[PDB]
Design a protein around this ligand. Sequence first.
Ligand SMILES: Cc1c(C[C@H](CO)CF)n(C)c(=O)[nH]c1=O
Ligand SMILES: Cc1c(C[C@H](CO)CF)n(C)c(=O)[nH]c1=O
Lengths: 320, 314
Amino acid sequence: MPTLLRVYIDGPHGMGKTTTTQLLVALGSRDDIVYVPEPMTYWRVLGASETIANIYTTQHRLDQGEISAGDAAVVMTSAQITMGMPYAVTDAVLAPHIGGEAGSSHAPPPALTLIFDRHPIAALLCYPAARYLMGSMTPQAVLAFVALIPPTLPGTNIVLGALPEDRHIDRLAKRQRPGERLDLAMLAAIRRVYGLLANTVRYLQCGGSWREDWGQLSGPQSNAGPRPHIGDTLFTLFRAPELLAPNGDLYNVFAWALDVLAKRLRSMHVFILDYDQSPAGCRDALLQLTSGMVQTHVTTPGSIPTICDLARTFAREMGE
Amino acid sequence: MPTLLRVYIDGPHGMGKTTTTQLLVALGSRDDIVYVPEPMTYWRVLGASETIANIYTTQHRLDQGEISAGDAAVVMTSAQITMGMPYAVTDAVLAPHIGGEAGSSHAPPPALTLIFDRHPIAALLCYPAARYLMGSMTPQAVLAFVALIPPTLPGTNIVLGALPEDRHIDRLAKRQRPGERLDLAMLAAIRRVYGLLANTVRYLQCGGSWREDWGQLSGPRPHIGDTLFTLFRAPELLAPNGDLYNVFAWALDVLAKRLRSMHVFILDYDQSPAGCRDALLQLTSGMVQTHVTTPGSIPTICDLARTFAREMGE
Ligand SMILES: Cc1c(C[C@H](CO)CF)n(C)c(=O)[nH]c1=O
Ligand SMILES: Cc1c(C[C@H](CO)CF)n(C)c(=O)[nH]c1=O
């Protein structure tokens, strides 16, 4: 069975994620690598009307006190369902085609390389959590999303981004999505979330156990480094009043959500790309990065062409 | 490895009695059976404040014309998340323990029997689909939920209820839930959804292919018009040329994959509580059992179930 390399390019928007990807795809042959692009069209029309505009407009009004927290929460939750839709369904139809791991460290080239614009967890965790830090969503809702995160397939290579705050602020200020607004508070939140995420993965892969270190709560990089403090991982966010019982402990329903969160991340292959350079540099940087990325076997000989058709149909329809 | 039997008591709400339910609480009394009840406490306090009320009030306000279909959709979509949270979490933590089939039936009794009050497709598929037929949810949000439906593990036995509409109206009016309003339209919609649902599983199990039979919605197994697929011949999901968008067509593929491997059993609710308990006990001799993955799986499950019942149960 021919091998396959799936690479999800995630992280906070506005760092040059797309450009880095497009350039990388432009290097390979026409049909030895395929890009599953950002589904702007689904966010803008197919799924709903201008979802990005709706999201930022809501956060704005909430900040001005024109609407309540409850009002902003119901809108955000719904919008994040629409945002994650293309991500979630692509995975669902992709799963059966994914087999066991093959490996990168000394292993032949993949018959096909799949490059994704973001991973499901982006719309089901990272951004939902960032909105919680903005009082625009509830911890209960976010955890509800976490429990919906699909099982992590073998060889799930996720690439996050690194970029100085100022460089990121300037870069973001220039290029923004249709319907977006310039929110620095949101940028901080989303940046902090992806920082935690990275730590949470390393923490988990170092034998970390949130249940064992939970008491250490009261008052970044993956693939490398020592075991992080739990207060520096995603777990630290859910030390909220709404989730705590009289005895100060988490309700078991939310504790099980954290068990799912850990189960999902502990088997991912997270990498970090330094977006503080020229587009050409980034392309090459990501290129070296992909060398040591876990590949997997497919389940059928006719899986490869199927996935190519899948990726291209996706691009043709939901692509900008 | 020890065997397990999972039974999801589903179907439209309001068909049974409280006595019919307490018998099921008396079933879990023994340690070879556990009864995961409805997470009412999570719906009223934990997840949010009086969720069911917010659902029925929103619909009511939509009908009177105080809010827009867009305003309602947002809330209904949010409310359904809260509703299915306990179901999703339980599945996610339970899944890893579930092994493969164990020559179900014609084989030794289970080491444990797990009875749930509803399956995750109740809050993800059925009720969202009904609210769509109520004009309170968009067909995009529904298929969005469908995409998030957990993979159907082996031994997924689901019991749906049978009951004349007039009889259902009686029992429903006497056992109303906190914040609920008696809506006959919603009763018709939810009944239709579960009707189609049963037709869908048979359709798929008899070799039905929605992409193949899709043309009939515009021009031995049920007709595609009698299955859940018929609802999604909706204008919001179609391109200018009437073609179903691929992203939605993929969501239907997922639906077809989820529903096919399930095992459906119908419980005649038109009788006494004792009669219902017996019938349910009868159906178990045809339900699919499975093995568990670890030795300590059994106690972990039992522990899980009773922690649920004690925390979110009434
Ligand atoms: C994914 C995602 C985003 C980022 C997305 C980048 O392609 C659109 F800019 N954003 C801004 C958001 O507000 N919610 C989301 O779920
Ligand atoms: C599951 C479910 C229901 C039915 C449920 C019965 O146990 C609570 F009454 N209802 C009324 C609802 O409005 N949304 C739902 O997701």
